[PDB]
Structure formats: C-alpha cells, structure tokens
C-alpha cells in the first residue's frame, strides 16, 4: 500500500497534433502544422521520461456513458481509430495494453462511494479517438500500461454542478485505488479549454496563417484561467469553472479536470504551463502539476 500520484496534466486531444507529427501509426501525411503545441507536448514528454510512471490514467470526453462510469477491463485492444470529424487527419492504428488490476480497483472504489460503475470486458471494443490522441502525445512509445475511464454524461443530462460533483467522487475513489495499488501513477485530463471553433476548415488544413482564436472572449477566458493555474490559485480557478464553462464553452465540463484535481486532493501549488495554442479556434493548453518536484511524491 505504498502507491502515489506523481503528476497531473491537462492533456488536450486535438487530432491535428498527431496529424502534424506524421507518426507511423497515422495514415494521413502532413507538411507540418501546430508546431508550438507539438513543442509544448515535447516538454511534457520529457517530464514523463524522468517521472517514469507505472500507469497512465486518462479521462476522455469522447467516450460518453449514460449508465455510470465505465473502465476498460481487457488486457489488450488493437484496431484503427478514425476520427469521425477529421478523418482526413486522423486514421490511427492502436495497440494498447491496459492495467486491468488497477482499473478494477478504481471501479470497486467508485461503487463503495456510491457511483454506478461498469467494467468494459468486450474484446472488440474500440477505444475513443481522444483517449488515443492524449496517450500518444504524452507517451508515443506506447510502453506504459493505461487505465481508460469513460465520461459519465450527468453534467449534460442533469445539472452541471451535480455532474461535476460525481467527477469529484470519481477522483476521490481513483486516489483510494492508486494508494492501495503500490504503483506510481500519472493522471491525464484529456480536455480542451475554450471550445468555440471554426465552422469551416482551411483548404490545406495545416495552413497555420488561417489558425487563430475563434472568439476574443474565449482566448481571454483561457488566459485568465492559465495565469491562475501558474500562480497556484486553484481555489479561484474552481470558483470560476461554471462561468468559464458557460462563457467560453469549455471542454472541462466533461469532468476530466475536476476528476484529476479531486484525485490530487485539490492542491494549491503553481502549475507549469508547457505551452498553449489554438486548434480550429479552440484553446488548448498543456498544464502539469508535477508533485515529485513539489516534494509530495518520491523520485524514481
């Protein structure tokens, strides 16, 4: 019972980053694009290399579940993940190894706390495009076991405060399962900030002169929240989340951010911004809460 969360990250999942990287798992070929955000993730990739995690846990908004919170429970899945909105940019062939023991643990800790939880045991299930993009941008070697958690739709079905409360319980249960696991975990919130976007796509999609924030209000909201995270004023960040989500149409309403902070026990330490960029007008920031550097977690 010696396990602990070593780092937390806001790992956005825009498929343009993978498109622009032209890795061998992606079928489309690009001439570049979104270089600032790819350099932002290069810094996060270096943190991960020194953190040496035992498991990566992702919460994605592109795996929507109505009956509770699901966890992937098969040892391995392989297939081709084609983004349904950007199939010209993302046609990825994935081969993922999951940590079933720890996913099972998080499911048992969520039922004890009162949430509805299920284990995905189907072996032909296709993991979502967002979970695969966040994982490849954080660790493209695909050599670290994954826990994949679905995004329960209570925030869009009932009230936005009720749904976010369920994400707080989920995070509290994740921490309980991590500590008992004996493993060194890294949480990844696959969420975008401002999600106001372009209604039309630039002819060469990677033409970066057609890339800018969609709204002035969204960029401003994104800059206000990132600065607060860089100063460690997380309490104020969570006081404003409902207004940020409504005024900037934020993708942190899925619950990954609240789940990640609840599992870290809502820390008020300064976050390191790895970088920020727009992807079809949406605001995407790579933010990290390195608890090994804070002294709250042990070094490798």
């Amino acid at each position: 019972a010696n396990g602990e969360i070593i780092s937390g990250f806001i790992a956005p999942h825009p498929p343009h980053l993978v498109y622009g990287e032209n890795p061998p798992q992606n079928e489309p070929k690009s001439t570049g694009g979104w270089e600032q955000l790819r350099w932002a993730y290069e810094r996060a990739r270096a943190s991960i290399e020194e953190l040496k995690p035992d498991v990566l846990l992702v919460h994605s908004p592109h795996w929507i579940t109505s009956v509770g919170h699901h966890f992937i429970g098969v040892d391995h899945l392989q297939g081709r993940s084609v983004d349904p909105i950007f199939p010209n940019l993302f046609r990825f062939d994935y081969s993922i190894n999951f940590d079933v023991e720890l996913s099972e643990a998080c499911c048992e800790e969520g039922r004890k706390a009162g949430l509805v939880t299920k284990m995905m045991r189907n072996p032909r299930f296709r993991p979502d495009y967002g979970t695969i993009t966040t994982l490849h941008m954080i660790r493209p070697q695909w050599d670290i076991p994954v826990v994949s958690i679905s995004a329960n739709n209570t925030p869009y079905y009932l009230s936005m405060e009720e749904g976010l409360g369920e994400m707080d319980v989920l995070g509290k249960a994740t921490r309980e399962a991590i500590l008992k696991s004996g493993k060194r975990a890294v949480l990844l919130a696959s969420n975008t900030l401002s999600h106001w976007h372009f209604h039309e796509e630039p002819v060469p999609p990677e033409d970066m002169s057609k890339e800018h924030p969609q709204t002035k209000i969204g960029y401003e909201w994104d800059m206000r929240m990132i600065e607060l995270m860089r100063q460690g004023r997380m309490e104020e960040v969570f006081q404003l989340l409902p207004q940020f989500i409504e005024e900037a149409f934020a993708e942190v309403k899925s619950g990954a951010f609240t789940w990640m902070h609840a599992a870290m026990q809502y820390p008020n330490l300064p976050a390191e911004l790895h970088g920020y960029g727009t992807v079809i007008g949406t605001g995407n920031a790579v933010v990290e809460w390195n608890l090994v550097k804070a002294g709250l977690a042990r070094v490798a």
Binding site: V67, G68, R80, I85, R91, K118, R124, E201
Partner: protein, 270 residues
C-alpha cells in the same frame, strides 16, 4: 418518387438482447417494416440517424462497401453488431454537390474503419437494407442544423435523387422520449420514465396515424421540449422534409420503452 417512409429506433438493445420480450417487439416490428419497405421496390434507401454527429461540414457516407464489426459505447456488455453496408457512391456524391450549390458545406466520408453509428447499423441489419441490390445514402446529424434546416436537407436530397429517376424509401433513425435510466435495472421493470412523456409520446404518435398535419405542427412546438425528445426530434423532421410536409396517415407497428427512452416503429402512407 418517394415510395416508402419509416421511423425506427436506434437502440441496439432489441438486437443484442432479444430474450427480453419487451425489447424483442421492436426487432420483429423493424423486421416487418423492412418487408413492407422492400415491397415498394425502392432503388435506394435515404437514412438519417441521430447517433451520427457532424460538427463542421455536412457528411454523407460514400464508401462503396463498408464491412466491419461495431461494439456500442454504452451497450458493450451485450455483444457486437457486424455489418456489411453498401452505399450508392454516385447518388451520395450528387447529394454532396447538391448541398454545395444551395450554400450547404458538404463532403464525403470514404475511409476504412470509419465510425458508422449504431443506429444506422441496426436499421440496416434489421430491415435487411444497404445491400448490393438495395444500397443506402446516409446523411449525418450536423449539431448546428435545427429542425427546420433538417427538413430542407431532406427536401434537397429527395429532389436530387428524384431527378435521376430513382425510387426512394426514406428512414429516420432515432427514439421519442429521451429520459433514460442511469442505473443497472432488470429488463422486465423497463417502462418510459415519466408519465408526461408517455402521454406526449402517445399523443404525437396518434396525430401521425390520423394524417392531421396542421394539428401535428401545433403539437411539435412543445413536444420536443415537453417529452425531452431525442436530438430535438430532428429525425422525424428529416422524414417530414422528404414527404414535402404532408402524408395521408401512418401505422404504428409498435410503441414501447427502451431503458426509459420512448421508442416506436412507424410506417407512413404516402
């Protein structure tokens, strides 16, 4: 030119779990309407499911033959749904060019492992449609397209295919009431959640069998909000658009609950 029109649910529960008699009634009804659909000798089937989302351009399926196996994101514990859907690549591309001319940004979708939605898959499998001799043309659910815009999109796709001298059968895939259970229940205790929606569901179905278009539009100004309809009932508006806002009446083959949702298999008389 439009020779048949049907509304079928998109849940996979009736095709993955037919041991539950409550859910088995939809499979049979759906199997029955396919026989009636096939009896009208259509040349192509126009499908619009609520589970296939589009966000930027309007998407049209254009893969000649899409052969794969799908596992539902919510109902992954009941099995898988294999499919072999053949599309009319010429007609689908003509619909993409028809939107463009009307100022509607459109593009095709022809990729291996493209995520076809569960609603389009079970409607094609249950109605035995989307085959080599009876192919389909599927339009996506753009989320920024409202009820009135969906009628214009259905109206445009029918005119386009009607001018090529083809006989069209049109299906709208989607449910009725949208409130569903959020906990694991025993399937025999299934029933539509609130009674308001049940009466609302019963009332709107009643107007469809009567052929009262004028009264149907009056009921449609509150039905979507009152019954918490799935996707704002845009899949019925798709059907309306292809029938030019009028049908003589309809035949409800079955109306029931699907995990709290209100579903129905309806057949329209042209």
């Amino acid at each position: 030119t439009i020779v048949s029109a049907f509304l079928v649910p998109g849940s996979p529960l009736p095709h993955l779990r037919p041991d539950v008699k409550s859910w088995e009634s939809f499979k049979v009804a759906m199997q029955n309407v396919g026989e009636k659909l096939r009896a009208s000798k259509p040349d192509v089937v126009l499908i619009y499911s609520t589970q296939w989302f589009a966000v930027l351009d309007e998407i049209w399926l254009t893969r000649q033959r899409s052969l794969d196996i799908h596992v539902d994101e919510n109902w992954h514990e009941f099995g898988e749904l294999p499919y072999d859907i053949y599309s009319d690549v010429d007609l689908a591309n003509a619909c993409i060019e028809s939107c463009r001319a009307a100022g509607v940004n459109a593009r095709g979708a022809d990729y291996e492992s493209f995520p076809i939605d569960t609603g389009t898959i079970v409607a094609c499998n249950a109605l035995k449609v989307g085959t080599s001799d009876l192919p389909v043309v599927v339009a996506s659910n753009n989320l920024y397209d409202d009820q009135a815009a969906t009628e214009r999109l259905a109206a445009l796709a029918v005119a386009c295919i009607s001018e090529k001298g083809k006989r069209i059968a049109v299906i709208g895939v989607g449910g009725l009431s949208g409130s569903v259970f959020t906990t694991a229940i025993d399937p025999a205790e299934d029933r539509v959640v609130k009674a308001v929606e049940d009466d609302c569901n019963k009332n709107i179905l009643s107007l469809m069998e009567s052929g009262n278009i004028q009264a149907l539009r009056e009921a449609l100004k509150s039905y979507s909000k009152e019954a918490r309809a799935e996707m704002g009932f845009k899949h019925f508006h798709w059907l309306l658009g292809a029938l030019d806002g009028h049908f003589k009446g309809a035949t409800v083959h079955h109306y029931g609950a699907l995990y709290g949702s209100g579903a129905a298999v309806v057949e329209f008389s042209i």
